Amino acid sequence: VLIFHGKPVHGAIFDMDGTMFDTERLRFQTLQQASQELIGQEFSHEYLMQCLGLSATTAEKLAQRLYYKEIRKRADEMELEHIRKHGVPIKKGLVQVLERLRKSGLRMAVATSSRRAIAEEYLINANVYKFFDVITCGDEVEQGKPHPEIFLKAASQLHLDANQCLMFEDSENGLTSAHTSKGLTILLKDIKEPNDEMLEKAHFYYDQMYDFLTDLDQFIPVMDMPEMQEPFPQSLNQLTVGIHGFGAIGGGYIAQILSHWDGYTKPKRIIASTRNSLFREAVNAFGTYSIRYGQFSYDERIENMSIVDSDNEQQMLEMYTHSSLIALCLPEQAIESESKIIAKGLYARFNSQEPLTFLIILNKVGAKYLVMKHLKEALLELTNDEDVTEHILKEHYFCDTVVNRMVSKLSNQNLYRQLRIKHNFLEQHLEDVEQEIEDCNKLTPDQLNQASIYVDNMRRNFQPGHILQSMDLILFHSETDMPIYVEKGSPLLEKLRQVVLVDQITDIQLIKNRLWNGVHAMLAWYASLMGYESIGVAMGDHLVKAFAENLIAEVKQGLAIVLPNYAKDLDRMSQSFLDSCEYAFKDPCQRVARDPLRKLNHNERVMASIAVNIRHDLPYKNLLKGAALGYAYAIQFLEIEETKAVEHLQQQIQNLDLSTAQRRQLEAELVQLIQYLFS
Amino acid sequence: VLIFHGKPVHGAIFDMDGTMFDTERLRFQTLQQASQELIGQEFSHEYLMQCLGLSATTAEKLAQRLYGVDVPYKEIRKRADEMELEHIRKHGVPIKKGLVQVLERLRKSGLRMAVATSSRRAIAEEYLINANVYKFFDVITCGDEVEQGKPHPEIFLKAASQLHLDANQCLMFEDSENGLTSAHTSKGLTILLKDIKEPNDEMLEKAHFYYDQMYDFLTDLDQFIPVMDMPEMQEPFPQSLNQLTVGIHGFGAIGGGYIAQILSHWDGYTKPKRIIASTRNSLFREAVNAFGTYSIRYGQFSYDERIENMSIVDSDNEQQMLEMYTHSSLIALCLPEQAIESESKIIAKGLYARFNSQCIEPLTFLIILNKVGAKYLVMKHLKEALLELTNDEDVTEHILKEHYFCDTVVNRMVSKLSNQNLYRQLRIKHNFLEQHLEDVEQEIEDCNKLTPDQLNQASIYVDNMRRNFQPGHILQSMDLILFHSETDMPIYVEKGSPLLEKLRQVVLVDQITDIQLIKNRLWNGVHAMLAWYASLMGYESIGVAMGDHLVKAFAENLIAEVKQGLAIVLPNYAKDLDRMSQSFLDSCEYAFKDPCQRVARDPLRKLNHNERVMASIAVNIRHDLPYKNLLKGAALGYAYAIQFLEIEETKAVEHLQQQIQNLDLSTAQRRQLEAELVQLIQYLFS
Ligand SMILES: NC(=O)C1=CN([C@@H]2O[C@H](COP(=O)(O)OP(=O)(O)OC[C@H]3O[C@@H](n4cnc5c(N)ncnc54)[C@H](O)[C@@H]3O)[C@@H](O)[C@H]2O)C=CC1
Ligand SMILES: NC(=O)C1=CN([C@@H]2O[C@H](COP(=O)(O)OP(=O)(O)OC[C@H]3O[C@@H](O)[C@H](O)[C@@H]3O)[C@@H](O)[C@H]2O)C=CC1
Ligand SMILES: [Cl-]
Ligand SMILES: [Cl-]
Ligand SMILES: [Cl-]
Ligand SMILES: [Cl-]
Ligand SMILES: [Cl-]
Ligand SMILES: [Cl-]
Ligand SMILES: [Cl-]
Ligand SMILES: [Mg+2]
């Protein structure tokens, strides 16, 4: 029992033509063309506007009163032929509404003046027939629209009174039929500006189907955080979403968040950009990819993916124009170059005629600031107009995020290895197939012969892709951490299941940077130099875990002074980190120790902690070792020249907010400890 | 924490060749096939059996002693390695029966698992990927990454430490002598698994546990891992496939729209690799084989459940039906009552073929039929068919006593889709395929990571993959709907078969009598009584009739009076009554398709003293409960008999009084029941 604007709703009855689909426009065009090639004289726009929401038999009465079977027969044939090519024109929001009303527990039906033969055809084609218990057509009804019989019979077969049921309609005739039934009427504008009589009759009015959805969703419960192996929604909405950077995070985390969505519907397509052409062509070839959750050996298939090239402009603009939500999953190095591609997409969005929710995924203190700064400079260079830029930057929701999940991208050699192995299975599967529907079961020889031609070329196309039932494409190794923490602002994020909304994101990002990402980087450098290629395996070493526990102590002692209000939560986050590290066997040290110099910056996870501890006379001995191991890793594994390492070290220590006495002591202690490791 | 024979287990380290994969017996075949080519004569089975455990040099010296000094052993051995990889890469690594079932059980028990193989890192990883078992293992330890290989404990000690565990916390699986020593010395719980050669007495002493095969360990492990709970609606099936095949003799409504789900869930750890299903419907057979999968619709939630790993066959085709009864570990007979006699022959031909085959494991036969003692009818006809075929009373009686013939009770109402509605679907889905195949008609950049040889070869793979798969991308969000079913999950089965013990959607009972008595009075009794009312009121189906507040109120008040009675007679099934009560009222709400005629057949028989109607009244009267709705139900039966079936009013009373006298009631209660009931019938005329 749903309470819609303080009304006890038990069921819902929808009109098909003009309300659910945009078919009234089509038959408007076909009746004109059909009439021209039969009788010659086209139908007047007055006749067609009067015939809106009227049974073919009832419309034939108005045809004779003013002045049809053969005309309408060809008009219907033209109409359904348009559906065979271009599909059903489904009004935006329909699928989203239907699922919410279904899961609310409402007893739903369709009340269309169309024939059963035609009514079903479209409901089957649109894939919404499943949402309805009964359907009342313009055949079984004795007196059709605008008489309330069709709406009364619909409610009667649902075993509910009309007053308990909602009633959707586009037409003037149908709204009378709905109102005379004495149900909770809803009017959706299609191809008729509502009259005063129509506006009064209706209990609720909305400009579009999507406008009702927004009003309905404040009475529909928001679904809770998904569990690990929880299925995605079956029914797809008409919204697109983007992932700028099909990498570890984008493909191996965000794709799950977007696939779960609100738990009612799922985006039609997910457009993800990558420079990795092997990854791009591999996913487009398979159609899907899977995220491997190693802990529970669970392979999570993600579908409705379309991987595009980052350099190809027409596909990058396609994303930013048609997408409802974009996720920026790029490293700091790419932010400046790609801000040019983002600016063009946002300007292309403005040039075209909904608000955008822009998620920024980046491990950096003030991650948004960097993006917005580079985006503003990029936009101004292209637009040459400060009036349009300040509008664009204010229009869309640019959201800060905190991602705790550890994800790993598959190496190109291991992806080639996978492709080589899985190709040999396909080759053998195509030998197994090697090389007529008889019996004649309640079907004409015409249909049975026509069925054979369908089943043959279907098998011919599908049979090679039967192996995909067992065969997956594994591209990402992820841990089982679900909740992404995002800044408040965007109404869209309120309804997303996997998104948790927080306030002081800046305070969390700072602790995240220092206590999580900082300890993760420093132990990864220590582990790499000891000769571990796995975070999970490395934490098995008593020294590696002892070092991490020693670092955590020194960082938390510092943060507790800088953020005394968060001092309570440090022990929980520190323990949560070690747990995620302990069994991260498929998470490599390489990925965690990327860009060491960038991470050894004065305003970053290593040096920032050291500085705080020096100012407040706290121990920084283990932090100082990790800094030295950071430069040790940079010179030994990456080979960046020792001369540059000192020039960087000195530059960063010069930028640290310390006294010259502390600066020179820090440099002297750190350079001494670096030379100690190499000797 | 997984407890195994009083020892807490946190990890599980596996040997690869001989323990997980049957690659030792493949090496036997390659060495023989390689010898046949080069030297002309095959190496004797006896020689190859003698070589198991010996080094490559010792085996070469032994070959030199038997087949001459100039025998090209290294040439044969290298040829045999090529034949092994060539076979493994296309046909797949031969996985030991029960491994995947074991791995899922250990993994879902939260064990950190590894592989301690003497093989090279490169080749070891390919085999584990080929077999699709790499996902189960946290880390691999290889022979080329240890200073001292087996029988030194270094490889097992290393594997354990990498999982953050002491050796004594881990199960260690092995086949070879050296490996068991390596495993034993490390201090881990050693599980010895026989591969080809019977283990020596020194090994059997050394090992903590010995099994003849992986499946004997799976049987032992099952005692320590729990049977999973009743599956919820919309709950996924297991991802991992076991090597078992199962059958559905009658791919109909109940077979394809219920049993398919039960067998798809299986035990919750794994599911059958192949579900064979027999039907005479050609359109259904070729359509499922075209998509390679079909889907079951649940209208109440608008959920489409996809049943994959299906394989439909013709019921008439003998070789296909024999292959079902030869290969299947469990078969579900989902036929009508009429088809029992006719299809008794093909069952007998099937079970006889299984007896003649060398198949070794017994069969679990689930009798899916809504009839009283339905098993008796199947066993009787099967007994006659076997004799007529074999003409041997010993073989006939042996087959019947060998297999498990389980009687069942099902509560899920299912509707098979029509051939017109299927053609409609096939026409509209084929349309979308053409709409998709005009888009497919409408490129590996400088990798700087791969070599240009394997960059060229990568393009050929992806191109070949895309060309074959891309036409079938539309199957992602396209389901072939063949069945419309209710949300009733639990199936009741006779306890006996060991294979049923771990099946999670199954409810085992010592005797089926109890749940059959509930099914009779609570479901079929109310269904019959509710149908009689609907018919007299002039409704096409019960689905339409529930719109009338009289019909729905009657149904809701009738299930209540029967439930109250059964709650006293069977207090142990209290939870089952309440579950089955609402399950009936939900299904009836929109029971449009199935008419009243079938349910209202033989009202004379259904109003017997020991039957679904009169039995409920007598129970309620004995325990002083309301029976006014049951009495109305009895009246509507005699009314339906006189009006529709054209029975005499004198014949109705002649039957009635006989049934009343047989009930265990007071002579006062008998006379009162008659006087009330005859009055209700006289009104229903007018
Ligand atoms: N992976 C993790 O566990 C976590 C990562 N993050 C953040 O996620 C962000 C995304 O990085 P990941 O996906 O982890 O790394 P990654 O290096 O695997 O990302 C690869 C993706 O970025 C694109 N890309 C890389 N460099 C590019 C460039 N110069 N120009 C254009 N596209 C480029 C690639 O085409 C591909 O789509 C990072 O900034 C990181 O701080 C957040 C927290 C944890
Ligand atoms: N469905 C429902 O309702 C039910 C049923 N049940 C049972 O089962 C059984 C079976 O069902 P079905 O419906 O599935 O059947 P069909 O008819 O549909 O099917 C059969 C098959 O087999 C052969 O014969 C052919 O071919 C086909 O396919 C019957 O007899 C009954 O009694 C029980 C419970 C419930
Ligand atoms: Cl390779
Ligand atoms: Cl390692
Ligand atoms: Cl660097
Ligand atoms: Cl198995
Ligand atoms: Cl049954
Ligand atoms: Cl019966
Ligand atoms: Cl009778
Ligand atoms: Mg209309």
Ligand SMILES: [Mg+2]
């Ligand atoms: Mg071995």
